[PDB]
Amino acid sequence: TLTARLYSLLFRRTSTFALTIAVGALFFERAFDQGADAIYEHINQGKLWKHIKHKY
Amino acid sequence: MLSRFLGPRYRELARNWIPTASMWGAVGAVGLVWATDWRLILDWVPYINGKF
Amino acid sequence: DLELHAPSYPWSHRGLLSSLDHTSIRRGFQVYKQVCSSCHSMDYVAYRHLVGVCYTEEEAKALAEEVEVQDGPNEDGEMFMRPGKLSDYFPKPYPNPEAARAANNGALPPDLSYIVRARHGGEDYVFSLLTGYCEPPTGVSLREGLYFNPYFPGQAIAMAPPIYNEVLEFDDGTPATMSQVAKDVCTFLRWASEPEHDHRKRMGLKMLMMMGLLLPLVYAMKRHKWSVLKSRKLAYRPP
Amino acid sequence: KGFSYLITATTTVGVAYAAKNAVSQFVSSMSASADVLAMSKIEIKLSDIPEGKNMAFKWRGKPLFVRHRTKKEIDQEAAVEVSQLRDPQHDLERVKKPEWVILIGVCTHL
Amino acid sequence: KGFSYLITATTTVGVAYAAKNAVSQFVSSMSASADVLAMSKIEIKLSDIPEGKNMAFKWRGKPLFVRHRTKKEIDQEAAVEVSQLRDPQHDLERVKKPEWVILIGVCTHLGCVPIANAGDFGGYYCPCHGSHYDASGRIRKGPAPLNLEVPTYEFTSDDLVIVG
Amino acid sequence: MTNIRKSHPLMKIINNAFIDLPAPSNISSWWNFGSLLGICLILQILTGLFLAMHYTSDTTTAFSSVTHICRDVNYGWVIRYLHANGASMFFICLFIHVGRGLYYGSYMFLETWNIGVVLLFTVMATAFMGYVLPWGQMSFWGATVITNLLSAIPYIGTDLVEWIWGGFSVDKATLTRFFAFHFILPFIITALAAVHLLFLHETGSNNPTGISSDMDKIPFHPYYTIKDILGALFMMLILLILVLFSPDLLGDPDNYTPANPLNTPPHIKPEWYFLFAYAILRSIPNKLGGVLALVASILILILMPMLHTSKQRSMMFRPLSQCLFWMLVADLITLTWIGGQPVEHPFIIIGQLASILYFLIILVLMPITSIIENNLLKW
Amino acid sequence: MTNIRKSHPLMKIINNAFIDLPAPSNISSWWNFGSLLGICLILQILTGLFLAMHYTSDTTTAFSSVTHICRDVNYGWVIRYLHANGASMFFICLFIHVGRGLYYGSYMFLETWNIGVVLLFTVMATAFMGYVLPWGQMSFWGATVITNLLSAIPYIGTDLVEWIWGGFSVDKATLTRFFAFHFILPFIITALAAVHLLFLHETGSNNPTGISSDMDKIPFHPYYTIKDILGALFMMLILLILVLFSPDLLGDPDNYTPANPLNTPPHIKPEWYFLFAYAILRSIPNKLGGVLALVASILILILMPMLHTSKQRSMMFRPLSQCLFWMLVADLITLTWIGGQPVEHPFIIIGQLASILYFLIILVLMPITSIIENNLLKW
Ligand code: HEC
Ligand code: HEM
Ligand code: HEM
Ligand code: HEM
Ligand code: HEM
Ligand code: FES
């Protein structure tokens, strides 16, 4: 099982656990910001200033 | 003080705790770069630099 | 007595995650500039705020430079007009509230920075007020200079009909029918009262997704820690 | 153990993102407001003073001398003890204009 | 014991005096400052007002009307009953000086355009909302929230009335 | 040699108050609110401080300062509405905390109960004064009415109200001193909260059953830390829903109009968490009677440990007592609604009956019912 | 059946704090300053409150509001000058307290000494912000000069300044920000003082002789309460003399001028209790080195417990160290005098000599003197 490999690699040491958390912070922050922003622009397509700036 | 802490087994303990302390320092460095959003370093990581 | 409750119009910015129609904001600003700005004001709003929501930077510069604002003392201590910039709030039509009250019968046209957030009902109230003028019903005689608007408390406003049909010329080319004018000005005033509306909804979306991700996980941690006690089995073995 | 600690790691990541995006929220609140970010883009004509006189302006938060320099300095200030003179500068590079020199008020000593 | 406790008692009474003064310092500090005791304080008028007219004033950040209610006006307001008002207020009950009605001038109910110094039912009338006023500043037509508010005026002597 | 957690002086207090504190293992979710209130307090202390760095307490510029906070400061609106709706959530949690105290018979902890009453009074005072700072129409007029309330006090009343006003009417001095008192008070609340916890820890806690849980205590840290973290996460969910989706849901729109002292608003209702009190005041025709009933509504919580007559500390084993408790909660809700509504024909009588029923349930119905309770159980 | 003094929780804490706490018999008068600090703190917390009750925080009404407090508020000038000179009294007591701790080797109490250093930093920051508040010429220009030091910090430094300034210069934002910070900080100081008293009580006070006095211990209440009352009376005498007879003795007259950013006063000096450090700032031309020396001038107290090399604890029986300590005090006074005078001959060279001598005495001369000292006594 993969989860066993994760535990033996990145989770056993508390400090390695913290390093994993820290790098996950970077990548989760970027991915989540992209996803949420994309969802919002999709919901309100054509109303935001970003979608109408081109014609000025 | 420093007379007591200068020992064979004391340097040996230092060596044992070198990896954990060093990568705790790496944890701190990554956390500092993240929280501060240090653009100077974050411009080189591939995916994240797309944010700027 | 009695009071009309403004019906809940289906505004585009009504859903939990539905932003404002910024094109409607752009049109509503022109509506304010050519009609409402004659006697109202949004002193809390400056031309700078329009940049990035309804006008581009150069357009905001051009809009500001079309008006003349008082400045500080010269080297001679006098007051001098100068064209505005993206740091001057919207000009006050009347220098002091007494002049405003005297010019418009005896009523003070309220400042519209918060007129949507200060009126019970919001955009619905203002929209119905503008598009709700009607001939007074029989038995009610308003003194000359007052106008019957059912939605206004007291049903007697000191307001001349603000927007009739084809008041101004929309630069977009949309017909300037009274209903369109009222919708656009109401959306613009909503933006004026709540400039953070779009970002508020965006942060609310992120908040919803983070709690939907966290609350199950923190609940799972709580169950993890407490599962020692939930499965705890006791036994009594008296002698 | 990996499953349980993965749950813990994921919630810790979420909390880290939230905590960052709230503490930066507050800190940016304490930073300079948009009203002063109507920033020091100041203007104003320079020909007011009658040659060789400083006029003080409030432009960023500290004074700014605006001055139409004396005719002697456009052509010869660079020749006034050019030598080395600690930090050597000439009106040609100090201000692109021949006359019409402008500089912020903060002294160099403190 | 008496000598020692006399030392203690005289110390304690001294401290009591000092503490009373120190506390009164702060308490009087919280009380009304000098300025609010100078502008919000009484603002006595004079006899600069002829019969019938109403001299405008600006006291305690509110307009003041000192209309010289003539005999005829007193007759109309005495004849007019009280229940016709939304808030029953007899002319003499609210105005202790029939020749001089003292009234703070503020159209109640969000100030929808009055008509000042002239009125269908008296000296003031407010037609925006049903708010016709009396020459004694009483609501006449329409149940407006209240009459024109009357402050605490005190006629010390001729041309000397101190108000709020 | 020894554990720092239980040998270091400060760490010893922290350990004995948050780590190894023996807490009952069966305390329901209603016990989480004691944490949330504290966290709310921190949040109120926090955001408010960040509000203090761009708010200038003065008549001619208080409202402009607030609107500049919400319109020109980076993310000023987040902090402002966090503060307002966090005060509202603070009062929600406070009412739920008092309800838990009433229900499960926690008032047998008399020292903690009285300290809680003092904290309650301090919090209502703090929120009332805080509502004045925006200097809106409702702010100014609610402050005027509530301070004029003290004029009903005999003899010294008018002097008291003119001293509080700092003049002759609510004005510059009142605003400034309200800001200063608003700054100082929450720290007094924090000190009283520390005293509250200190008094509580000597008697442990009250589990829902009302029986002594000395045979079942569990360490606080492994379990109730994560329990309270989950509770705080839920409270943050609710608070952020309020802030980011309907900020002014629990607020009077008219507060967004600069305070004009020449125009009385058509409605002068106080904040939503005061109406239950305010309605009581409107019930009694007498002014002094109104103020006395107003104060006594809060003060009646002190009398509860003397009015407990049942032989069971809790309420879960006392059905008829539960019915009266929920009648009391419904009465409180009715009082809030009545205070919200104007004082007209259908509401005057309802408010009078609601206030009478509230006092009567607390003082009369519950003790007699508990006597019947004990009689029914052959003890 | 028991004393509620030693059984009631709050009363038990008070009893162990300053009623039945075992205190050394031979405690000299120099210890009174401890309480003379706390009393000052209370006074500073008190009067400041009554100042914040008539003080706005906008740059268009800061100076005018201060003049309003001085001229119009009933007895307001008493409070204003009581605050202004109670700050100087606070710092006099603080410096004498640090000197006492240094002389009698009280820094062996490591936790209390470090907490004291933290308190010193907090008090200095609070006083700086407070002096910024009245928006005089001294206020504005000293604030600019002091905050501009943070530009010397590498990399982040410039940003940090723009962060604290809330913009591009000390302006409207910074005034209100400093008001909020000056309000909040003293309560943090009070909390730290409570922690300090806790740490000190875990070991007990140190007598002038430097030797453990567990045998000759006396109860605190009957003796040291009245001793502290006398100390408070003397300090009130000095403070009231200052306020009533010569209020603008320790201040600077240029602070009575509205802040004008386009013109500076002839001299830019800070408050007196800061000059000792400001002179050190002026000693090193390297700006970053100047800031580092400025911080180290206070942080040296942290290292002071480490440098203790003498077998004895106090300075009662160390004449050589006594002359060294008085050399240090004279050096601090010299730095204070130097700070006021402008940067001219011979103040520049005298300032460099004094700044060098300060660190030379603390770091080198004292430990070497103690080393010679032990050798002179067979140990
Ligand atoms: C030439 C004068 C004039 C024009 C044009 C005008 N107004 Fe007004 N407005 C007034 C006056 C006078 C009042 C005061 C009425 C009262 O208070 O009784 C008023 C009242 C209002 C109110 C108060 C409603 C309430 O009860 O709170 C709103 C909202 C308002 N105007 C919005 C607008 C909008 C939107 C426009 C145009 C797009 C507009 N006005 C055009 C003069 C004008
Ligand atoms: C006991 C906790 C607190 C409560 C219940 C509370 C309550 C309130 C309320 C209800 C408001 C009105 C908000 C609005 O109408 O927009 C307010 C405003 C304010 N509070 Fe607080 N507050 C608390 C703590 C604090 C603290 C500790 C500070 C100071 C650090 C503070 C500073 C302010 C300021 C400056 C305002 C005016 C700005 C505003 O209106 O939002 N508050 N407070
Ligand atoms: C400032 C607001 C308050 C704070 C921060 C606070 C804090 C706390 C905390 C943390 C607890 C322990 C957790 C718990 O048992 O629920 C507690 C318990 C308690 N509080 Fe409060 N409290 C506050 C207000 C009140 C009020 C208003 C009362 C009632 C008058 C009160 C009475 C109690 C009682 C009786 C307990 C014991 C509960 C039990 O163990 O069964 N508190 N308080
Ligand atoms: C906020 C200001 C301060 C307060 C309120 C305070 C409070 C106290 C009090 C009341 C005492 C007991 C009386 C005494 O021995 O003097 C004390 C002792 C002490 N304080 Fe402070 N203190 C303050 C600042 C400092 C500073 C700046 C230091 C030095 C870094 C310091 C270090 C000590 C030491 C070492 C003792 C023990 C003295 C001895 O045992 O002989 N304190 N503190
Ligand atoms: C740690 C104790 C404190 C110290 C050392 C301190 C120090 C100062 C200083 C030096 C000033 C400038 C005096 C001047 O204008 O010449 C000042 C002003 C002020 N302080 Fe404080 N302060 C303290 C506590 C407080 C507290 C707790 C408050 C709030 C309740 C406060 C509010 C003020 C106000 C409003 C001013 C401006 C009035 C004025 O400057 O005269 N202070 N403070
Ligand atoms: S309009 Fe004057 S009272 Fe209604």
Side-chain angles (χ1 to χ4, degrees):
Chain A
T1 175
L2 276 189
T3 318
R5 284 71 201 170
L6 281 103
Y7 166 69
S8 73
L9 222 71
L10 307 142
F11 281 177
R12 160 196 295 295
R13 276 220 263 285
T14 279
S15 38
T16 318
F17 192 67
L19 188 31
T20 279
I21 262 55
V23 189
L26 250 53
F27 281 82
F28 174 66
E29 171 176 0
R30 174 110 183 79
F32 181 83
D33 272 351
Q34 272 198 328
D37 287 311
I39 274 162
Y40 191 141
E41 301 146 80
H42 167 58
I43 296 178
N44 311 168
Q45 175 78 310
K47 302 194 294 198
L48 276 274
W49 176 256
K50 159 177 169 71
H51 307 136
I52 86 186
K53 37 159 54 164
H54 64 97
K55 37 212 299 185
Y56 307 98
Chain B
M1 31 175 67
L2 89 163
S3 41
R4 138 164 69 116
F5 303 112
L6 210 35
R9 144 191 171 281
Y10 274 119
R11 287 144 251 163
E12 202 285 338
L13 252 50
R15 276 213 220 107
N16 288 263
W17 266 353
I18 280 314
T20 89
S22 86
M23 161 294 298
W24 265 127
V27 152
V30 160
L32 177 272
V33 153
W34 164 64
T36 288
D37 256 7
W38 198 343
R39 204 161 171 300
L40 172 132
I41 288 304
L42 277 204
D43 273 298
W44 292 139
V45 51
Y47 182 40
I48 311 312
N49 61 52
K51 154 197 313 156
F52 324 108
Chain C
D1 200 274
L2 282 318
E3 268 99 12
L4 271 283
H5 279 25
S8 45
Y9 283 85
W11 297 99
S12 87
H13 62 282
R14 155 136 297 174
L16 255 61
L17 306 118
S18 76
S19 91
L20 281 143
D21 184 294
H22 282 195
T23 300
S24 169
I25 299 187
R26 150 177 284 263
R27 274 197 312 274
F29 169 76
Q30 286 150 120
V31 155
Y32 156 73
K33 195 191 145 232
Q34 294 145 267
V35 196
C36 155
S37 70
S38 316
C39 276
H40 290 264
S41 90
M42 297 161 260
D43 48 4
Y44 301 130
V45 180
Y47 294 109
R48 149 191 36 115
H49 295 90
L50 318 171
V51 193
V53 282
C54 60
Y55 282 82
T56 190
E57 163 98 28
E58 311 88 350
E59 265 179 331
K61 295 259 193 53
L63 261 295
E65 276 129 23
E66 288 143 13
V67 84
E68 289 213 332
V69 191
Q70 209 83 336
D71 214 314
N74 326 62
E75 41 266 28
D76 45 49
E78 260 89 358
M79 281 314 81
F80 70 119
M81 280 298 148
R82 56 106 161 88
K85 78 197 68 53
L86 280 61
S87 186
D88 297 0
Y89 300 95
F90 290 161
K92 285 193 177 297
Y94 298 100
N96 54 341
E98 259 91 31
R101 202 181 266 93
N104 325 126
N105 246 340
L108 190 77
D111 188 275
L112 319 172
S113 297
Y114 282 109
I115 209 63
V116 179
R117 206 97 99 80
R119 278 314 161 279
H120 268 132
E123 310 95 317
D124 297 326
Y125 170 62
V126 168
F127 186 86
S128 273
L129 210 168
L130 306 166
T131 80
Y133 278 24
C134 82
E135 155 74 42
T138 171
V140 180
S141 171
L142 273 61
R143 185 291 301 261
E144 178 43 64
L146 321 159
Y147 310 84
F148 179 83
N149 168 292
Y151 284 83
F152 179 70
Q155 313 100 11
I157 207 158
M159 180 146 177
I163 59 164
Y164 43 99
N165 225 334
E166 43 88 43
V167 170
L168 52 87
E169 171 275 310
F170 276 130
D171 66 322
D172 193 343
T174 87
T177 176
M178 185 208 329
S179 158
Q180 182 66 222
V181 181
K183 201 202 95 98
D184 298 14
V185 68
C186 271
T187 287
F188 165 60
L189 290 179
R190 168 54 105 175
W191 166 85
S193 305
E194 185 161 32
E196 76 272 8
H197 184 106
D198 293 333
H199 189 214
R200 187 170 57 80
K201 307 198 128 46
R202 169 184 255 107
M203 274 188 358
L205 174 51
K206 315 233 186 118
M207 181 305 278
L208 278 196
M209 311 216 307
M210 213 67 19
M211 311 285 328
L213 181 163
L214 265 156
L215 267 188
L217 287 177
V218 178
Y219 186 43
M221 281 176 68
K222 186 267 183 163
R223 291 312 216 77
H224 178 20
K225 282 294 194 211
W226 269 82
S227 86
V228 172
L229 297 196
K230 274 57 175 40
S231 52
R232 159 173 97 186
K233 312 239 167 225
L234 291 93
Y236 189 40
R237 314 269 315 211
Chain D
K1 267 189 290 321
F3 174 60
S4 285
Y5 295 142
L6 163 66
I7 293 306
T8 286
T10 309
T11 166
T12 299
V13 156
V15 176
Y17 167 63
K20 149 134 152 61
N21 207 144
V23 178
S24 73
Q25 258 307 343
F26 276 69
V27 169
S28 209
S29 89
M30 177 161 7
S31 173
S33 44
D35 162 51
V36 311
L37 271 293
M39 93 75 58
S40 73
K41 284 309 283 146
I42 214 178
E43 52 285 28
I44 316 155
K45 160 197 91 63
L46 203 151
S47 54
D48 37 30
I49 77 91
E51 179 257 24
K53 265 290 220 183
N54 285 105
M55 152 90 108
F57 273 178
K58 159 82 141 44
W59 98 264
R60 199 175 277 247
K62 64 278 192 191
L64 174 74
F65 323 113
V66 74
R67 170 223 277 125
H68 158 47
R69 63 171 56 260
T70 46
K71 194 44 72 172
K72 173 268 190 165
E73 311 176 350
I74 302 93
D75 48 57
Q76 184 270 357
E77 171 66 290
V80 175
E81 186 177 270
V82 50
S83 61
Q84 155 78 359
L85 196 38
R86 327 152 181 140
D87 210 7
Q89 285 192 50
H90 334 95
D91 294 357
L92 56 101
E93 78 269 18
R94 299 216 65 147
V95 50
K96 60 196 41 157
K97 293 152 269 323
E99 314 83 35
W100 260 249
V101 51
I102 39 178
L103 62 101
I104 317 83
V106 182
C107 161
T108 60
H109 166 261
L110 293 106
Chain E
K1 264 180 296 303
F3 173 70
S4 297
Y5 294 144
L6 187 69
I7 297 285
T8 309
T10 281
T11 301
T12 282
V13 54
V15 173
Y17 174 73
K20 158 145 180 214
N21 302 357
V23 169
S24 300
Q25 281 341 294
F26 293 2
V27 155
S28 34
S29 97
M30 262 166 48
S31 99
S33 57
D35 38 25
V36 297
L37 280 196
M39 66 83 108
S40 197
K41 158 167 93 87
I42 44 185
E43 316 98 344
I44 173 187
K45 341 294 158 211
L46 313 97
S47 193
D48 68 332
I49 169 76
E51 214 55 46
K53 221 267 198 193
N54 42 356
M55 191 36 48
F57 288 118
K58 187 97 203 115
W59 304 130
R60 200 161 300 179
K62 291 194 231 93
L64 256 289
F65 300 153
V66 278
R67 154 174 308 279
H68 213 333
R69 205 155 101 271
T70 83
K71 277 206 51 48
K72 283 84 41 197
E73 319 267 17
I74 308 149
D75 290 280
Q76 282 74 80
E77 282 97 59
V80 164
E81 70 100 4
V82 283
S83 292
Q84 159 263 344
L85 296 77
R86 190 205 141 272
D87 48 316
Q89 223 84 8
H90 172 54
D91 166 43
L92 182 72
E93 291 331 291
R94 64 206 322 278
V95 189
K96 297 319 287 170
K97 291 316 285 204
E99 78 294 338
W100 273 302
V101 51
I102 287 290
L103 63 168
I104 220 170
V106 279
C107 159
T108 54
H109 165 276
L110 77 155
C112 208
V113 50
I115 297 268
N117 79 46
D120 198 356
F121 295 28
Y124 318 97
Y125 93 82
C126 189
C128 210
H129 157 270
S131 38
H132 262 286
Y133 276 109
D134 218 342
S136 149
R138 311 134 40 98
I139 198 54
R140 302 294 307 283
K141 150 258 204 176
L146 292 94
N147 303 313
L148 259 174
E149 208 278 342
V150 164
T152 89
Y153 54 110
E154 291 76 38
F155 254 123
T156 68
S157 185
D158 64 317
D159 65 90
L160 305 172
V161 54
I162 58 197
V163 310
Chain F
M1 190 42 57
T2 178
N3 188 344
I4 272 161
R5 187 169 39 81
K6 41 160 55 75
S7 67
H8 188 258
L10 205 41
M11 236 80 69
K12 196 146 38 62
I13 276 144
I14 294 321
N15 174 32
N16 285 23
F18 305 95
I19 313 270
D20 287 343
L21 165 68
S25 85
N26 73 292
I27 50 151
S28 86
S29 56
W30 302 117
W31 278 251
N32 273 47
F33 293 85
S35 311
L36 317 185
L37 269 175
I39 281 158
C40 270
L41 176 52
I42 290 323
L43 180 78
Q44 292 305 119
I45 298 185
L46 194 42
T47 64
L49 181 77
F50 277 65
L51 283 177
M53 311 186 308
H54 328 85
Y55 173 79
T56 81
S57 53
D58 186 292
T59 297
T60 184
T61 186
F63 194 75
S64 34
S65 69
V66 175
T67 198
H68 145 85
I69 283 197
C70 312
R71 202 161 301 212
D72 269 352
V73 199
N74 297 335
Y75 306 117
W77 68 271
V78 157
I79 282 161
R80 193 261 179 99
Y81 293 111
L82 258 183
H83 204 48
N85 305 280
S88 296
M89 165 88 32
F90 194 110
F91 270 88
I92 299 179
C93 302
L94 247 188
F95 291 152
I96 293 159
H97 203 85
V98 179
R100 197 270 333 272
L102 262 279
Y103 195 102
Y104 293 105
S106 285
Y107 39 91
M108 301 325 198
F109 283 158
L110 330 177
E111 291 321 2
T112 65
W113 188 253
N114 314 137
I115 294 283
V117 179
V118 182
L119 284 143
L120 181 50
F121 273 119
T122 314
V123 169
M124 335 202 61
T126 295
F128 160 65
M129 321 205 287
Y131 200 63
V132 187
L133 289 314
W135 204 243
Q137 269 290 89
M138 226 47 62
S139 164
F140 167 78
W141 291 97
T144 280
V145 173
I146 281 143
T147 45
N148 263 278
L149 248 195
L150 261 63
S151 303
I153 288 279
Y155 202 47
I156 70 200
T158 293
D159 293 345
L160 261 189
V161 304
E162 283 156 325
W163 189 57
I164 265 49
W165 290 338
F168 292 153
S169 43
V170 182
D171 211 40
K172 165 43 191 63
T174 307
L175 188 48
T176 318
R177 94 181 50 201
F178 272 32
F179 177 53
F181 284 140
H182 200 32
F183 220 135
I184 181 54
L185 260 197
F187 308 111
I188 291 165
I189 311 199
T190 284
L192 267 41
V195 180
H196 185 20
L197 278 189
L198 161 64
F199 277 148
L200 173 71
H201 283 173
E202 287 189 354
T203 78
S205 319
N206 186 6
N207 73 89
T209 76
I211 325 174
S212 293
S213 67
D214 266 352
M215 72 271 314
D216 176 78
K217 292 313 202 316
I218 47 158
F220 190 99
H221 154 53
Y223 304 115
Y224 291 127
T225 52
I226 200 50
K227 184 93 171 313
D228 296 13
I229 276 153
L230 175 57
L233 206 40
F234 266 103
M235 157 267 271
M236 231 55 101
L237 172 58
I238 309 289
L239 172 56
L240 287 203
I241 279 173
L242 271 181
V243 170
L244 315 173
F245 288 132
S246 200
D248 63 341
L249 165 65
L250 299 141
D252 202 316
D254 299 324
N255 225 16
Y256 292 98
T257 284
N260 172 243
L262 322 163
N263 170 23
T264 311
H267 39 278
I268 46 56
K269 76 192 107 39
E271 267 288 66
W272 78 267
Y273 38 93
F274 282 139
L275 299 154
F276 91 93
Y278 183 49
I280 299 271
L281 154 74
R282 306 218 262 89
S283 311
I284 272 55
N286 183 284
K287 307 322 174 249
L288 185 47
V291 186
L292 273 153
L294 181 38
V295 152
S297 89
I298 317 295
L299 223 48
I300 210 162
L301 307 175
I302 270 168
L303 283 132
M304 303 281 339
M306 320 203 326
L307 290 171
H308 187 148
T309 84
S310 100
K311 284 227 222 294
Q312 324 210 106
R313 190 226 199 91
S314 166
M315 254 195 200
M316 105 169 51
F317 307 127
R318 273 147 76 232
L320 317 177
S321 292
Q322 318 203 3
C323 325
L324 283 149
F325 179 87
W326 296 119
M327 227 170 313
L328 161 77
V329 182
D331 194 299
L332 262 296
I333 291 189
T334 319
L335 279 172
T336 280
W337 162 62
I338 280 307
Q341 294 314 314
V343 55
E344 321 315 300
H345 147 65
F347 303 111
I348 290 158
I349 167 73
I350 291 186
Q352 270 148 338
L353 300 169
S355 45
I356 293 157
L357 179 65
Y358 157 72
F359 283 114
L360 163 75
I361 294 204
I362 288 185
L363 288 138
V364 166
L365 266 290
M366 262 203 238
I368 300 164
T369 295
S370 297
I371 298 304
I372 292 138
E373 292 295 350
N374 301 153
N375 182 23
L376 284 195
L377 265 184
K378 337 181 56 63
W379 63 6
Chain G
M1 54 298 298
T2 169
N3 314 107
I4 39 154
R5 180 165 51 86
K6 57 153 51 84
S7 323
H8 189 287
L10 274 277
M11 312 285 118
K12 208 218 306 310
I13 291 145
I14 291 318
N15 171 76
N16 310 318
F18 26 67
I19 286 181
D20 284 351
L21 158 82
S25 169
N26 63 302
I27 277 297
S28 96
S29 92
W30 295 109
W31 278 251
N32 289 16
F33 293 88
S35 63
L36 260 69
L37 276 168
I39 283 135
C40 272
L41 182 52
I42 287 306
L43 185 78
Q44 287 279 165
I45 297 206
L46 224 58
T47 55
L49 191 38
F50 288 75
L51 283 190
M53 283 202 317
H54 308 81
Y55 173 63
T56 60
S57 95
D58 188 290
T59 70
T60 65
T61 52
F63 196 67
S64 67
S65 59
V66 175
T67 64
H68 160 62
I69 302 176
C70 290
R71 306 157 152 279
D72 285 329
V73 169
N74 304 338
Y75 294 124
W77 66 268
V78 194
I79 294 123
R80 196 262 166 114
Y81 285 129
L82 207 51
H83 215 68
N85 308 265
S88 289
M89 210 51 214
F90 198 113
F91 266 107
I92 283 173
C93 299
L94 247 190
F95 287 137
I96 285 156
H97 213 246
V98 178
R100 195 271 337 271
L102 201 92
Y103 185 84
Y104 295 107
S106 296
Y107 42 86
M108 301 335 278
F109 302 150
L110 315 150
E111 301 76 0
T112 85
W113 181 259
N114 307 321
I115 285 283
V117 181
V118 184
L119 289 141
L120 184 44
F121 269 119
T122 322
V123 168
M124 284 165 80
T126 324
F128 162 54
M129 294 156 165
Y131 197 54
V132 181
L133 287 181
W135 206 245
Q137 273 294 104
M138 271 315 98
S139 167
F140 170 77
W141 289 107
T144 39
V145 171
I146 283 284
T147 51
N148 260 303
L149 271 43
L150 269 161
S151 311
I153 286 269
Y155 212 74
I156 71 167
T158 293
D159 278 8
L160 208 29
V161 181
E162 279 151 47
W163 191 59
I164 291 144
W165 280 351
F168 301 137
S169 84
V170 152
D171 206 349
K172 174 163 101 143
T174 305
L175 189 48
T176 86
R177 175 193 268 86
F178 278 174
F179 183 31
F181 278 143
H182 183 78
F183 216 132
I184 171 64
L185 261 196
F187 311 111
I188 300 165
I189 310 189
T190 317
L192 287 145
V195 185
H196 199 208
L197 285 195
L198 164 61
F199 275 126
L200 165 69
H201 288 195
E202 311 315 289
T203 86
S205 305
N206 156 80
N207 62 61
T209 84
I211 326 167
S212 302
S213 74
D214 286 347
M215 71 295 298
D216 206 26
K217 290 263 159 113
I218 68 162
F220 188 97
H221 157 50
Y223 297 109
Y224 286 116
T225 57
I226 188 54
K227 177 94 104 151
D228 284 52
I229 287 313
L230 180 50
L233 258 280
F234 252 119
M235 175 221 70
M236 228 55 92
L237 173 93
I238 302 301
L239 182 50
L240 282 199
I241 281 164
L242 209 55
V243 175
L244 291 180
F245 290 119
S246 98
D248 313 286
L249 163 55
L250 293 183
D252 205 306
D254 296 325
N255 204 35
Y256 287 125
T257 317
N260 172 232
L262 300 305
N263 165 35
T264 82
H267 51 56
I268 330 172
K269 77 169 42 65
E271 271 280 50
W272 75 271
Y273 42 76
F274 284 147
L275 293 158
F276 90 86
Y278 192 55
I280 277 144
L281 205 179
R282 215 196 311 299
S283 266
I284 317 154
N286 177 219
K287 184 86 37 152
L288 209 169
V291 175
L292 268 38
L294 193 37
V295 184
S297 147
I298 311 280
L299 217 78
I300 271 284
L301 300 188
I302 283 269
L303 293 159
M304 167 65 57
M306 168 205 175
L307 298 211
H308 184 106
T309 39
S310 149
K311 293 314 283 291
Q312 290 148 216
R313 170 204 253 256
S314 76
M315 285 216 208
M316 191 145 198
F317 318 111
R318 300 212 255 109
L320 290 194
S321 293
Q322 267 171 42
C323 325
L324 260 291
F325 171 79
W326 293 117
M327 225 151 274
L328 187 73
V329 176
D331 184 280
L332 255 52
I333 290 184
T334 326
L335 282 170
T336 288
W337 160 60
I338 275 295
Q341 317 287 357
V343 202
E344 315 281 11
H345 185 261
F347 304 126
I348 309 166
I349 180 66
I350 291 176
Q352 283 144 270
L353 265 300
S355 44
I356 289 157
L357 180 70
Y358 164 77
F359 293 111
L360 182 53
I361 289 193
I362 293 200
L363 298 150
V364 189
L365 260 302
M366 283 214 188
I368 299 208
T369 288
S370 312
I371 287 288
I372 299 151
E373 258 276 86
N374 301 322
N375 260 311
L376 285 188
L377 281 168
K378 294 322 151 183
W379 57 19

